[PDB]
């Protein structure tokens, strides 16, 4: 079986620029083709016999390589090609997939819009508290929430998930929720949830005094 | 039109065995070999069957579980996996060969392999407040919490309201069930005349529910 390593892993470029993205196979192939994937959907054809642009590509794409070597190329880079990219061989059994190569936007650095919500009233009726935090529409991804419950840091009661970048603005958002039984939540005043992104020069607390609508 | 419209979500015990649909619509089935395609979590090419002849090929690696069929009479191709581990929970596509390469892919088959019963989402409202408002506009979402397996899927006003809303990809917790969230922004002087449902669908459990979401002083 003919791996594909593709390389980088990861990349960002933004408007107009150009990229290049890098697909080895580990023995001689005769085209290797491309597929893009973005989040939600499943992939589509790209390019096959390692230059020909499928139906709806724009032309700035386009590929090159012969041997074990290829390459994709965008000229100019625009919004829509942020995706997943997995190059692909039909040239021996069994066919086989790249490992991909994720292409984001790169943008300039925004700060999170950052909003906390506390246990519904229904919620609190059967016994449980999820407290939500949420950091909307911010730039880069990497980012950091502690949870503090008067002032205690909080450790193993939270969990977090991340959104892939906007279509509009090319932001993430993300959110947090720690959940705690009603018996342990009624124990407490302060609920805050401290953000920590370059986007900000010092860390965000945002909090709520239990009980206040 | 053309569209591979691939059976829903499985949720199949360990060791016993789950078969998966792929019905070719709006073009002529026979004219087109189908693949699969396994998407563990990166795509990994499970094999072909002619949807003419029937003959198959498959990935080493899948022989002993993989298993293809076709029945021509409803256009629909299957495949069988068997002998369920873990390492078989993964997104399944079927993809329709063309001319130059995969053309046309169904939306693909989520299958969640585990003993464990079906498990229908609670949702909780994210009510909008000033804890939630920034610049005249306001956050709101709904919480899906402790539902088996994925997906779930989330719309706000039967689909009316799309511009604004992030819906999160679930979290695995503790106690082994999935919770997300879906939230919208929208104009603070939209509170108070124009409501906001939220509606999910958990497909594993039956599960249908709507839920408005009401602001607060």
């Known amino acids: 079986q003919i791996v594909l390593t593709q390389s980088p892993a990861i990349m960002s470029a933004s408007p107009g620029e150009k990229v290049t993205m890098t697909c080895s196979a580990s023995?001689?192939?005769?085209?290797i083709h491309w597929y893009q994937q973005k989040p939600g959907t499943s992939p589509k054809g790209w390019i096959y016999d390692t230059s020909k642009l499928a139906s709806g590509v724009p032309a700035r794409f386009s590929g090159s390589g012969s041997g074990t070597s290829y390459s994709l190329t965008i000229s100019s880079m625009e919004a829509e090609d942020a995706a997943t990219y997995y190059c692909?061989?039909?040239?021996?059994?069994?066919?086989?997939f790249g490992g991909g190569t994720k292409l984001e936007i790169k943008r300039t650095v925004a700060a999170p819009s950052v909003f906390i919500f506390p246990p519904s009233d229904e919620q609190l009726k059967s016994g449980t508290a999820s407290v939500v935090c949420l950091l909307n529409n911010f730039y880069p991804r990497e980012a950091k929430v502690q949870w503090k419950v008067d002032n205690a840091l909080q450790s193993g009661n939270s969990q977090e998930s991340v959104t892939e970048q906007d279509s509009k603005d090319s932001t993430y958002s993300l959110s947090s929720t720690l959940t705690l039984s009603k018996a342990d939540y009624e124990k407490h005043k302060v609920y805050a949830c401290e953000v920590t992104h370059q986007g900000l020069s010092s860390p965000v607390t945002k909090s709520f005094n239990r009980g206040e609508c | 039109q053309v569209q591979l419209q691939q059976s829903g979500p499985e949720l199949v015990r360990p060791g016993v065995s789950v078969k998966i649909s792929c019905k070719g619509s709006?073009?002529?089935?026979?004219?087109?070999?189908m693949h699969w395609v396994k998407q563990s979590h990166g795509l990994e090419w499970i094999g072909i069957?002619?949807?003419?002849?029937?003959?198959?090929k498959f990935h080493q690696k899948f022989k002993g579980k993989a298993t293809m069929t076709v029945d021509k009479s409803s256009s629909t191709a299957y495949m069988e996996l068997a002998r369920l581990t873990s390492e078989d929970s993964a997104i399944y596509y079927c993809?329709?060969?063309?001319?130059?390469?995969?053309?046309?892919w169904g939306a693909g088959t989520t299958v969640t392999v585990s003993s464990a019963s079906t498990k229908g989402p609670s949702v909780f409202p994210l009510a909008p407040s000033s804890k939630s408002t920034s610049g005249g506009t306001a956050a709101l979402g709904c919480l899906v919490k402790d539902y088996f397996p994925e997906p779930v899927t989330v719309s706000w006003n039967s689909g009316a309201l799309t511009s604004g809303v992030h819906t999160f990809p679930a979290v695995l917790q503790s106690s082994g069930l999935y919770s997300l969230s879906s939230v919208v922004t929208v104009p603070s002087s939209s509170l108070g005349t124009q409501t906001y449902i939220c509606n999910v669908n958990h497909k594993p459990s039956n599960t249908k529910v709507d839920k408005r979401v009401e602001p607060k002083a």
């Open positions: 023995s001689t192939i005769i085209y």
């Open positions: 709006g073009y002529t089935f026979t004219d087109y070999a």
């Open positions: 692909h061989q039909r040239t021996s059994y069994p066919w086989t």
């Open positions: 993809a329709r060969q063309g001319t130059w390469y995969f053309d046309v």
């Open positions: 069957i002619s949807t003419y002849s029937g003959n198959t």
